[PDB]
Design a protein around this nucleic acid. Structure first.
Ligand SMILES: [Ca+2]
Ligand SMILES: [Ca+2]
Lengths: 266, 1072
DNA sequence: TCGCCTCGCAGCCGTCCAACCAACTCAAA
DNA sequence: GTTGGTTGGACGGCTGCGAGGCGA
């Protein structure tokens, strides 16, 4: 049997399908990084770092052995390993398997697909099978550490923030958290404000609300990226104790997708 | 008195158009050294040689070139009392001319010859040589062309009651002709007679009464046939007097030995007086056909001469590197090399160099020629183009080389010379052949053709392209390939510079001109083209000139005409075999039908004369037994069998094949020179036999019968299917094969037995023999072939075992690569090493092919691909054993990016057709390189020359330098056009090659061949080949630096497995 | 009256197909 | 001729933005 085996059927397959539903085509060209803890999907959208961690526990069965494997999601520069998780690409989808075989750095992933047929017969779509050898060498740089501040925004609150975000490099935007727990985002022509609090439309729940800060971002990318990914409300995660500060926005809907934006040094 | 018929070549000349390069005025100031002088000059044309000077047109003792001339300008320069007795003479050519009794009244011809040309008659002139090497012309009198017309049709139309009346009608139709160019003709110029003949077309055709009409002139014949009674079909009006002379005199030939003999009333050939000579010959005779006999036993060629010549020209316009145009007065012939050989001994006898301007051959050249034992070059110098060209044509007329050769002389040298002579100078050419005037001397484009009366032009370019397969047919490439004689070339780009420099450098031009003619002479005496052409001329009953230049049809036509006349006829004037592409590691036996189409014609008695489109034609005959019924193109056709009526085509083929067998039997016992002649003969017979099928199929050809042609192919197709079904039925099991061929017992290989046809073309079948070994199989194959032949087909149809492949890639119809049992590789219908590619792609492509065929691991794995449809291989691991094939691609990929790599392997090249501003598609790699050369460091430029280039990676500096100077008259994602680079620059700066460009062209090349392994599906092939290459991923350098300063951790890379694992655990914790 | 959500239209980009130029021709100079 | 870049246009799948309608 294959050393590494991944299965999605039933409830777990439904969970994954729901997670991918808002993401549309956004992740179809991506790096898949596979290890014991799950599949980390990585891409860049409008120059910004985008991640989707699919935890091992979210799969019906998950077994991994040997080193981390990385795969480009595209096979023969056409079909994607993640095309199976598009909302309506396989209407009768019933089961998906990943088998990874061979030895590093030359292992092959095989993806197999089943559809429930009349009377609930699980028939394999053999012609839709996908095969991919791992990247023989890869480097990916990944977020680490605990954020200094976390602020959870509902879908209306985040869309207000994206509207307050600057339209171009010539009109940058500032994110600030003040001594009184006032959180605010502003630029040359507009401003938005919220009352942050530790875990009523202006109330924002969070962690380390007492840690005041001011940070700036030049790019309009944060609005474009988070709309592209269809983020329906999310946690703003601020990383401040680094040479370049960073903001990670993690979605709170069906998708667990995250975009990371570099912040102007203080 | 002077000549009876005026000599039209120049024997005197005292003014001419003087054209010479001004640079020859090496005393003149630099302001007047460019361009040509072009004006008339009032003096006799002159030639200089070795410090002496002579009039070009003077004949006498001290000439600078050899002569084989008796008359010059109507003066007899023969020795005192010159009167050689002629008995035997060789004929190499035959002319056809009209003479008129009135014109010849002052010549002293015997009455019998005058009567034959009263008032006009066709004279057949045989040209050749006596054993003593005297040039002879023998004028044969009394041959008349003739055609036939149906008596009933003519009588019913013209109300004719007697042959007298018909002659009046024809004479009247010529008197009344447009342009009046026959007024003077009368019914006396014709003879009509009633004969019984049969139209050659169809079995049911009854013998009928025809008028056979004799005419005295080909001109007259051609008009009547194309204008007289157009509703009435003419027969054999196309047949020339030479053909009638040959066919109506049994045994006569167009090339061979003859004897003068007494004729009927004890008549003898009459020697002409010199002033009545029609040609540049030593002796001339008048005779009739009864004064001639073929001389048996004599076969050696007499001492004919060969001239091998080559011209050099100099473009004289604003660009000295432009191709010279004969109509441009300033574009000059500047030299002519002329080597004269004895064609019987092959000895080189004279080396002449005609030079416009003074010319001193290099001492090294002279020493080399002396060491080789060759004649010392004679250098003929001239002040002008006209003087030189006139001297050359003077040599041609006076020396009269019966055979002329060179390289591309038909398509270049002759047309260029004759354009100069005809258009610039106003020289008539019609006296420069053998005839002293009014002879044919003409070039015409189709490539191109030449006809010069009495002169057999054989262009070695034609001979070599028709005989040897080469990457280039440039003379130097040919000399390397054929003579193993590697040598240097002087570029046309060099000529203007050498020419201007002086007599020593013009001498270097001369050396290279001489060397070129010497090489051509070697090619000529290697291939001996005159011997094969003369063989065909003799067989076909046509002259050697028509043999060279007319098509295949006339050869079969003339032979058919001979037989048809003998037989009383007159000739009227006008899918299961498809291959599944794939790779076979089981042996493939090739069965080949021997001369299939000829054999079908003979076996099935096909002919014009056996065919019927009507059932009532053969209702008196027994079906099957007496005729073949066959559906062809939707029609029912009948062909009666040989015992009902024998096919004329059958007879021709049978007799030729019997003759060819007799000749090939005599060779093992023949002397070394006999072996050469017998070999040429048997080869001539083969080419004529193989043309019979084609002859019947030419719509609008001489004597078409598309019904015969179609029947041949239809029977062909059915025989191949019959061969397949017989093989399949008779040898489905090994036990059946062993019962026929018991030696097959030891031939049994381990796996399942099968014997199936996998391919078949027009005349061969490929039989895949699963479960048999390749070793005994070629021998058992020939006994299979014999057995099949016996069981299925009529003699002389023969199936033969041709070869056995051990490995075979069937690509498509007529495309395959196979290894023969002896280990040799055979490639058909594909090129592996295309000229558009760099050496890297060509070498790697060939290496992949060699691996498929010579690594059994790869071979067996490649065969295993056939077990599954092509799409399935996308979804599963490929057969184990293809690993090495993948390794070649990975190595090739790695070799592109290697900093230690030879740039020269990756160099492409493109010429500059014209200045870069004159292009429309200005995005071309070589134009990008042209402007980069200019832009950076004003690197050495180019014009009408080959620019080498390499395709380079987009290293940002290329983007910055993309602003080319062409604007003085893309900014991102650059085109291949823009990423082109000078290889010297690329070497000097360690620039990276474009991996995508080179590797995609390698995968392209691979998909031409290996696509057959995957259903001929190029996209799957490309995908599966691309999959072998290692993929890597990294963030860009700037991004990576930024993310590291943002505190991002590294995953994969050179980190340990544990570091990577832990880092991903951190990622999942942060991203959640 | 203002904000949010949904639907439609426009711009976009990648794929493919057909046509056009141009080089080897190509070999003589 | 034939082939290889290129180019320019049809078109098909997709996402974003703007406007209109409905609900609070
Ligand atoms: Ca030549
Ligand atoms: Ca030449």
């Amino acid at each position: 049997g294959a050393p590494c085996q991944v299965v999605l059927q039933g409830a777990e397959l439904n969970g994954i399908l729901q997670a991918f539903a808002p993401l549309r085509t956004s992740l179809l060209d991506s790096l898949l990084v596979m290890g014991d803890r799950g599949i980390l999907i990585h891409n860049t959208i409008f120059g910004e770092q985008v991640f989707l961690p699919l935890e091992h526990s979210q799969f019906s069965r998950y077994r991994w052995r040997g080193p981390t494997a990385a795969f480009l999601s595209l096979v023969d520069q056409k079909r994607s390993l993640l095309s199976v998780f598009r909302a309506n690409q396989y209407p009768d989808l019933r089961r998906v398997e990943l088998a990874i075989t061979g030895q590093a750095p030359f292992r092959t992933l095989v993806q197999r697909i089943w559809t429930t047929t009349s009377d609930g017969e699980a028939v394999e779509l053999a012609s839709e099978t996908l095969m991919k050898r791992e990247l023989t060498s890869f480097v990916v740089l990944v977020p680490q550490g605990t954020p200094d501040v976390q602020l959870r925004l509902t879908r209306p609150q985040l869309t207000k923030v994206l509207n307050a975000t600057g339209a171009d490099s010539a009109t940058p935007t500032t994110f600030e958290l003040g001594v009184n727990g006032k959180f605010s985002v502003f630029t040359t022509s507009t401003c938005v404000t919220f009352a942050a609090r530790e875990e009523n439309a202006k109330t924002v729940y969070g962690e380390n609300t007492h840690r005041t800060f001011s940070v700036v971002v030049d790019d309009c990318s944060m609005r474009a990226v988070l709309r592209r990914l269809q983020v329906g409300g999310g946690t703003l995660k601020f990383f401040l104790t680094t040479p370049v500060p960073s903001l990670c926005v993690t979605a709170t809907g069906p998708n667990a997708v995250s975009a990371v934006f570099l912040l102007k040094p203080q | 008195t002077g000549p009876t018929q005026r000599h039209t070549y120049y024997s005197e000349c005292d003014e001419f158009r003087f054209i010479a390069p001004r640079v020859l005025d090496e005393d003149a100031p630099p302001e007047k050294r460019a361009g040509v002088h072009d004006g008339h000059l009032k003096r006799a044309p002159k030639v200089y040689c070795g410090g002496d000077e002579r009039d070009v047109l003077r004949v006498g003792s001290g000439g600078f070139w050899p002569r084989r001339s008796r008359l010059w300008g109507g003066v007899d320069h023969a020795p005192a009392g010159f009167n050689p007795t002629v008995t035997v003479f060789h004929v190499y050519d035959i002319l056809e001319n009209v003479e008129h009794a009135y014109g010849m009244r002052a010549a002293q011809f015997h009455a019998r010859f005058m009567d034959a040309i009263t008032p006009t008659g066709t004279v057949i002139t045989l040209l050749g040589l006596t054993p003593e090497g005297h040039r002879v012309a023998v004028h044969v009198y009394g041959t008349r062309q003739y055609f036939y017309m149906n008596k009933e049709e003519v009588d019913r139309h013209l109300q004719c009651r007697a042959p007298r009346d018909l002659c009046e009608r024809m004479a009247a139709a010529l008197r009344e002709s447009p342009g009046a160019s026959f007024r003077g003709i009368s019914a006396d110029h014709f003879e009509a007679e009633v004969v019984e003949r049969t139209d050659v077309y169809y079995y049911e055709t009854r013998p009928a009464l025809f008028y056979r009409v004799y005419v005295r002139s080909g001109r007259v014949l051609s008009y009547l046939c194309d204008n007289f009674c157009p509703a009435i079909k003419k027969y054999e009006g196309g047949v020339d007097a030479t053909t009638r002379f040959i066919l109506d005199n049994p045994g006569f030939v167009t090339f061979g030995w003859y004897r003068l003999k007494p004729g009927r009333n004890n008549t003898l050939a009459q020697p002409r007086a010199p002033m009545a000579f029609g040609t540049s010959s030593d002796v001339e005779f008048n005779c009739t056909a009864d004064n001639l006999a073929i001389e048996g036993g004599m076969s050696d060629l007499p001492a004919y001469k060969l001239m091998c010549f080559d011209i050099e020209c100099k473009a004289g316009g604003e660009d000295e590197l432009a191709f010279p145009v004969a109509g441009h007065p300033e574009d000059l012939v500047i030299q002519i090399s002329c080597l004269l050989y004895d064609l019987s001994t092959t000895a080189l006898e004279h080396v002449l160099l005609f030079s416009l301007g003074s010319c001193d051959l290099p001492e090294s050249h002279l020493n080399e020629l002396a060491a080789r034992g060759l004649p010392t070059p004679v250098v003929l110098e001239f002040d002008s183009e006209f003087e030189m060209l006139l001297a050359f044509m003077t040599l041609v007329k006076q020396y009269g080389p019966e055979f002329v050769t060179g390289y591309n002389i038909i398509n270049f040298d002759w047309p260029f010379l004759l354009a100069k002579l005809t258009d610039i100078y106003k020289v008539p050419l019609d006296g420069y052949g053998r005839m002293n005037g009014r002879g044919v001397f003409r070039v015409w484009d189709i490539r191109s053709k030449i006809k010069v009366n009495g002169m057999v032009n054989i262009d070695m370019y034609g001979i070599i392209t028709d005989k040897i397969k080469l990457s280039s047919y440039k003379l130097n490439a040919v000399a390397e390939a054929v003579l193993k004689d590697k040598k240097k070339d002087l570029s046309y780009r060099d000529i203007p510079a050498y020419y201007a420099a002086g007599p020593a450098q013009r001498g270097v031009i001369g050396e290279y001109c001489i060397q070129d003619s010497l090489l051509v002479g070697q090619l000529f005496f290697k291939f001996l083209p005159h011997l094969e052409l003369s063989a065909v001329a003799r067989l076909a009953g046509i002259n050697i000139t028509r043999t060279i230049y007319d098509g295949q049809q006339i050869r079969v036509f003339t032979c058919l005409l001979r037989l048809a006349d003998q037989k009383g006829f007159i000739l009227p004037d006008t899918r299961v075999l498809d291959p599944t592409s794939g790779f076979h590691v089981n042996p493939v036996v090739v069965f080949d039908f021997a001369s299939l189409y000829p054999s079908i014609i003979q076996a099935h008695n096909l002919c014009f004369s056996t065919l019927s489109l009507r059932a009532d034609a053969v209702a008196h005959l027994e079906a099957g037994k007496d005729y073949l019924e066959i559906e062809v193109g939707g029609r029912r056709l009948f062909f009666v069998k040989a015992h009902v009526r024998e096919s004329l085509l059958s007879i021709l083929l049978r007799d030729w094949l019997a003759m060819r067998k007799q000749i090939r039997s005599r060779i093992p016992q023949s002397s070394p020179e006999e072996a050469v002649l017998l070999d040429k003969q048997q080869a001539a017979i083969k080419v004529v036999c193989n043309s019979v099928y084609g002859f019947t199929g030419v719509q609008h050809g001489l004597l078409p019968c598309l019904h015969v042609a179609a029947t041949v192919t239809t029977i062909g197709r059915e025989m191949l299917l019959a061969t397949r079904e017989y093989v399949h039925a008779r040898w489905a099991a090994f036990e059946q094969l062993l019962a026929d061929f018991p030696e097959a017992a030891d031939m049994r290989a381990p796996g399942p037995y099968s014997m199936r046809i996998i391919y078949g073309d027009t005349d061969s079948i490929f039989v895949l023999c699963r479960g048999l070994t390749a070793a005994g199989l070629t021998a058992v194959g020939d006994k299979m072939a014999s057995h099949i032949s016996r069981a299925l087909f009529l003699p002389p149809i023969k199936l033969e075992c041709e070869k056995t492949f051990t490995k075979l890639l069937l690509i498509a119809k007529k495309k395959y690569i196979g290894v023969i049992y002896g280990g040799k590789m055979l490639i058909k219908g594909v090129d592996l090493v295309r000229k558009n590619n760099c050496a890297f792609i060509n070498r790697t492509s060939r290496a992949l092919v060699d691996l498929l065929f010579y690594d059994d691991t790869v071979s067996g794995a490649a065969a295993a691909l056939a077990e599954r449809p092509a799409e399935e291989w996308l979804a599963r691991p490929l057969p184990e054993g293809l690993q090495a094939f993948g390794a070649v691609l990975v190595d090739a990929h790695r070799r592109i990016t290697d900093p230690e790599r030879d740039i020269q392997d990756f160099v492409l090249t493109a010429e500059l057709s014209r200045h870069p501003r004159a292009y429309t598609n200005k995005r071309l790699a070589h134009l990008t390189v042209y402007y980069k050369l200019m832009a950076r460091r004003a690197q050495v430029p180019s014009i009408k020359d080959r620019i080498p280039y390499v395709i380079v990676a987009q290293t940002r500096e290329v983007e910055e330098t993309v602003a080319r100077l062409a604007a003085l008259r893309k900014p991102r994602k650059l085109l291949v056009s823009e990423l082109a680079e000078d290889p010297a620059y690329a070497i000097a700066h360690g620039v990276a090659l474009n991996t995508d460009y080179y590797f995609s062209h390698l995968l392209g090349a691979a998909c031409v061949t290996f696509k057959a392994l995957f259903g001929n599906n190029a996209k799957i092939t490309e995908s599966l080949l691309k999959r072998f290459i290692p993929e890597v991923w990294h963030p860009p350098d700037d991004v990576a630096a930024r993310l590291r300063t943002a505190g991002f951790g590294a995953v994969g890379a050179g980190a340990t497995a544990e570091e990577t694992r832990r880092m991903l655990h951190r990622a999942f914790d942060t991203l959640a």
